[PDB]
Scaffold this active site. Structure first.
Site, PDB file in Angstrom:
ATOM      1  N   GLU A 167      13.402  36.631  36.864  1.00  0.00           N
ATOM      2  CA  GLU A 167      12.752  36.481  38.495  1.00  0.00           C
ATOM      3  C   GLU A 167      13.063  34.973  39.599  1.00  0.00           C
ATOM      4  O   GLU A 167      13.369  35.282  40.342  1.00  0.00           O
ATOM      5  CB  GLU A 167      11.582  36.591  38.145  1.00  0.00           C
TER       6      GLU A 167
ATOM      7  N   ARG B 153      10.392  24.782  38.678  1.00  0.00           N
ATOM      8  CA  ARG B 153       9.456  25.568  38.522  1.00  0.00           C
ATOM      9  C   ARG B 153       8.199  23.778  38.735  1.00  0.00           C
ATOM     10  O   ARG B 153       8.435  24.028  37.310  1.00  0.00           O
ATOM     11  CB  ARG B 153       8.786  26.149  37.426  1.00  0.00           C
TER      12      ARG B 153
ATOM     13  N   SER C  58       1.927  38.296  43.345  1.00  0.00           N
ATOM     14  CA  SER C  58      -0.186  38.423  42.822  1.00  0.00           C
ATOM     15  C   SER C  58      -0.298  37.070  42.177  1.00  0.00           C
ATOM     16  O   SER C  58      -1.252  36.590  43.392  1.00  0.00           O
ATOM     17  CB  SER C  58       0.634  39.476  42.119  1.00  0.00           C
TER      18      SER C  58
ATOM     19  N   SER D 149       4.575  30.646  42.515  1.00  0.00           N
ATOM     20  CA  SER D 149       5.437  29.874  41.419  1.00  0.00           C
ATOM     21  C   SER D 149       5.990  29.228  42.539  1.00  0.00           C
ATOM     22  O   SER D 149       6.419  29.970  43.802  1.00  0.00           O
ATOM     23  CB  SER D 149       6.726  30.594  41.223  1.00  0.00           C
TER      24      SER D 149
HETATM   25  N1  LIG Z   1       1.777  48.060  50.221  1.00  0.00           N
HETATM   26  C1  LIG Z   1       1.441  46.897  49.924  1.00  0.00           C
HETATM   27  N2  LIG Z   1       0.669  47.594  48.452  1.00  0.00           N
HETATM   28  C2  LIG Z   1       0.486  46.256  47.131  1.00  0.00           C
HETATM   29  N3  LIG Z   1       0.269  45.429  48.137  1.00  0.00           N
HETATM   30  C3  LIG Z   1       0.754  44.508  49.253  1.00  0.00           C
HETATM   31  C4  LIG Z   1       0.952  45.573  50.152  1.00  0.00           C
HETATM   32  N4  LIG Z   1       1.626  45.210  50.687  1.00  0.00           N
HETATM   33  C5  LIG Z   1       1.814  43.761  50.856  1.00  0.00           C
HETATM   34  N5  LIG Z   1       1.158  43.202  49.817  1.00  0.00           N
HETATM   35  C6  LIG Z   1       1.147  42.017  48.839  1.00  0.00           C
HETATM   36  O1  LIG Z   1       2.011  41.382  48.462  1.00  0.00           O
HETATM   37  C7  LIG Z   1       1.055  41.415  46.529  1.00  0.00           C
HETATM   38  C8  LIG Z   1       2.063  41.572  45.728  1.00  0.00           C
HETATM   39  O2  LIG Z   1       3.553  40.376  46.167  1.00  0.00           O
HETATM   40  P1  LIG Z   1       5.188  40.567  45.151  1.00  0.00           P
HETATM   41  O3  LIG Z   1       5.984  39.291  46.129  1.00  0.00           O
HETATM   42  O4  LIG Z   1       5.602  41.921  45.271  1.00  0.00           O
HETATM   43  O5  LIG Z   1       4.808  39.968  44.113  1.00  0.00           O
HETATM   44  P2  LIG Z   1       4.656  40.560  42.521  1.00  0.00           P
HETATM   45  O6  LIG Z   1       5.969  40.297  42.184  1.00  0.00           O
HETATM   46  O7  LIG Z   1       3.542  39.589  41.593  1.00  0.00           O
HETATM   47  O8  LIG Z   1       4.714  42.725  42.682  1.00  0.00           O
HETATM   48  C9  LIG Z   1       0.458  41.847  46.351  1.00  0.00           C
HETATM   49  O9  LIG Z   1      -0.896  40.876  45.709  1.00  0.00           O
HETATM   50  C10 LIG Z   1      -0.465  42.142  48.287  1.00  0.00           C
HETATM   51  O10 LIG Z   1      -0.757  40.279  48.343  1.00  0.00           O
HETATM   52  C1  LIG Z   2       3.773  34.697  36.245  1.00  0.00           C
HETATM   53  C2  LIG Z   2       4.427  34.707  37.570  1.00  0.00           C
HETATM   54  C3  LIG Z   2       5.742  33.879  37.701  1.00  0.00           C
HETATM   55  C4  LIG Z   2       5.167  36.760  37.481  1.00  0.00           C
HETATM   56  O1  LIG Z   2       5.193  36.427  39.230  1.00  0.00           O
HETATM   57  C5  LIG Z   2       3.381  34.726  38.615  1.00  0.00           C
HETATM   58  O2  LIG Z   2       2.963  35.738  38.428  1.00  0.00           O
HETATM   59  C6  LIG Z   2       3.086  33.342  38.736  1.00  0.00           C
HETATM   60  O3  LIG Z   2       3.652  32.053  38.781  1.00  0.00           O
HETATM   61  N1  LIG Z   2       1.781  33.255  38.328  1.00  0.00           N
HETATM   62  C7  LIG Z   2       1.285  31.929  38.570  1.00  0.00           C
HETATM   63  C8  LIG Z   2       0.722  31.338  36.832  1.00  0.00           C
HETATM   64  C9  LIG Z   2       0.156  29.610  37.202  1.00  0.00           C
HETATM   65  O4  LIG Z   2       1.176  28.647  37.515  1.00  0.00           O
HETATM   66  O5  LIG Z   2      -0.616  29.713  36.462  1.00  0.00           O
END
Ligand SMILES: Nc1ncnc2c1ncn2[C@@H]1O[C@H](COP(=O)(O)OP(=O)(O)O)[C@@H](O)[C@H]1O
Ligand SMILES: CC(C)(CO)[C@@H](O)C(=O)NCCC(=O)O
Ligand SMILES: Nc1ncnc2c1ncn2[C@@H]1O[C@H](COP(=O)(O)OP(=O)(O)O)[C@@H](O)[C@H]1O
Ligand SMILES: CC(C)(CO)[C@@H](O)C(=O)NCCC(=O)O
Ligand SMILES: [Cl-]
Lengths: 360, 362
Positions: B132, B201, B186, B189
């Protein structure tokens, strides 16, 4: 010497901490000479465990048979909500406190905020002291005297495994350098190189006030004790997204185990997931979210400053061995055992003790 | 040498799945002759809809137009749907004969691992699983190099705190190293990037976009990310948080904390009177501020410790989120006395999918 009663006060964002020395070496001739109002306040403090609607004496923190400023006696540890400060100042007016003595040593931001109210309503002058200066003086003194034949400070061996976790004693004998993480309503992080030489490295507003406040909103709880009660029977993994919820296992390339939290509250945008969690789960999730954030920030500070011992204090840690074990594991695991978490028995009162030691 | 159409990159994250699709605009009648029927329908399915099934969305405003990529001319589209609806995507995979397009599809994110077996059994597809963070680096470096239809990919906010003077100005990522890259998904990193092949990282935080969105749903009853941000735009966080002012009666002068700084986020919410005073909007605003300033603080500490002065913030937390971007920009500037600069990107959430696409094309 200053006149009795000997107090130190720490007026925080959420709690007021009051440390009172009860002299136990009053002679007949002193009792003879002593004023009625002093006698009344002394017996009010030592014969009641609750004070008004909200004030509480933490009886089991009582240090017995200390020698302070040439007098033998007991240290009492008393707290109440900062919200009830108007009642407290009014009490001082009605109890003629300025007649016992006009000046009292106080720390915390409330020492500044409430200065004018103390003067106008109570006729009292605050000797205002710095909250972090007082904290340092207090922990060092309280450590050196011990806790009625037990250690003031301790650490958790094998904090992650309930099969082997042990609470073991520790002395601040040659403690420097050390990182001191003060978890109150907010968090201050101190690098301490001696008793006289220290700096505030950083802080975070995601403190105990964020834990308690969110819990009240999310669960309908109204007291800290209730928030913790709920958290101790909750499951955070229903609320949080773990690394394994995202990867189906570890993210090995960057050493993230499946059990690590990937996203705090990260399942709660799902209606289905919201429906399956309880208030108890939400309380526990709030607990680990706030704690692990503090732990991570302290770890980064510790490694950057080249300090290996981190002491955690503040009333967020009251009845909060869950938080203490998370902080212990957080520093140990991610640093591969380089960093060490230390904790204390009188976690919230060191500032108030510092104010008392300044007096004397 | 190059693989046959269709060309896709996939990033299966914790909250969102991101798909990047190269629409060829150079198809000859002769090539069409040789193309299978499942390819013809999928191409038109993608280009004639901006919404797919129940929850798929094409971000039409991000479309990169008249791109040349691996000897072919066409447009790059950016598509997203919730990871929660992955079962339907995989079933659609069988219904639309994705396996007759390609045997393999390039996928990054945790879900490339999580859903591998599902994709094979139900979808008849092998996932080519890719890292990723590697895909993130390759994607942002590629997307910056091509630019955004004449505009710069990356940008910064001049005077971010004042709506009178706030300006979005271009920033060239030519000779950008070293840089800190803060991926706000979500979770978060945080990377120190020394070159295109050299990065580490540094750390991360679980208090990310998922924490903002999750808490907003619980505290306000909002069901969408758009609603959450709408609510936060109309709120006042100072009814929710405890300021330094509320504790000291002004500044904490000894250690330079101004009266207006937050002392305890959600710190007033222990008080019943304060709880009865706040609105859903106030709570949404407080949640936005708390998650964003905490990420800013952590990023600031990483930047200063690594002697990095440039911080690029990415991830879908920042989608339609100029308010958080301006807070990040202000906080980094203020608390470092103009030493650290916050940078942002136009294709914030799609860089990993682009990386997966570039891996497919060699
Ligand atoms: N339409 C949407 N649905 C859900 N989350 C969204 C949306 N638009 C923006 N977000 C935000 O984007 C985040 C997910 O980010 P993203 O970069 O796609 O990470 P991941 O790989 O963890 O899915 C959600 O936690 C939320 O804060
Ligand atoms: C697990 C990943 C790498 C997946 O995107 C991300 O959600 C993340 O980096 N979470 C935080 C983990 C931590 O640094 O405690
Ligand atoms: N009985 C209680 N009432 C309120 N807060 C409590 C109580 N017990 C523990 N706490 C915790 O202690 C925190 C305040 O800690 P403290 O160290 O006294 O800092 P402050 O100086 O900000 O008052 C609260 O935010 C809460 O998490
Ligand atoms: C304002 C104080 C020092 C009051 O104890 C404390 O609540 C705190 O340090 N809060 C947040 C600190 C920060 O944002 O760095
Ligand atoms: Cl195609």
């Amino acid at each position: 010497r200053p006149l009795f009663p000997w107090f130190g006060l720490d007026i925080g964002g959420t709690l007021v901490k009051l440390v009172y020395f009860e002299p136990k070496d009053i002679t007949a001739e002193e009792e003879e000479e002593e004023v009625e109002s002093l006698k009344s306040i002394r017996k009010y403090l030592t014969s009641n465990v609750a004070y008004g609607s909200t004030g509480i004496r933490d009886v089991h923190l009582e240090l017995k048979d200390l020698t302070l400023c040439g007098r033998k006696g007991n240290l009492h540890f008393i707290r109440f909500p900062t919200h009830d400060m108007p009642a407290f100042i009014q009490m001082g007016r009605d109890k003629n406190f300025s007649s016992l003595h006009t000046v009292f040593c106080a720390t915390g931001g409330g020492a500044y905020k409430f200065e004018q109210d103390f003067l106008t309503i109570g006729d009292l002058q605050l000797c205002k002291l710095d909250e972090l200066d007082c904290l340092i003086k207090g922990i060092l003194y309280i450590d050196s005297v011990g806790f009625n034949g037990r250690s003031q400070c301790y650490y958790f061996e094998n904090p992650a495994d309930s099969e082997k976790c042990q609470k073991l004693p520790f002395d601040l004998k040659n403690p420097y350098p050390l990182l001191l993480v003060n978890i109150g309503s907010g968090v201050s992080i101190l690098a301490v190189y001696s008793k006289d030489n220290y700096k505030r490295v950083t802080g975070t507003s995601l403190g105990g006030g964020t834990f308690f406040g969110l819990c009240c909103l999310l669960t309908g709880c109204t007291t800290f004790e209730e928030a913790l009660e709920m958290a101790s029977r909750g499951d955070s993994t229903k609320v949080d997204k773990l690394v394994r919820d995202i990867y189906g296992g570890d993210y090995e390339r960057f050493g993230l185990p499946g059990w690590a939290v990937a996203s705090s509250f990260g399942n709660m945008m799902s209606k289905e997931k919201r429906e399956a969690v309880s208030k108890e789960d939400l309380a526990r999730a709030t607990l680990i979210t706030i704690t692990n954030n503090i732990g991570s920030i302290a770890r980064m500070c510790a490694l950057n400053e080249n300090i290996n011992q981190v002491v955690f204090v503040g009333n967020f840690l009251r009845i909060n061995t869950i938080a203490m074990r998370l902080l212990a594991y957080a520093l140990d695991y991610w640093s591969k055992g380089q960093l060490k978490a230390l904790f204390s028995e009188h976690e919230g009162y060191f500032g108030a003790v510092g104010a008392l030691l300044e007096l004397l």
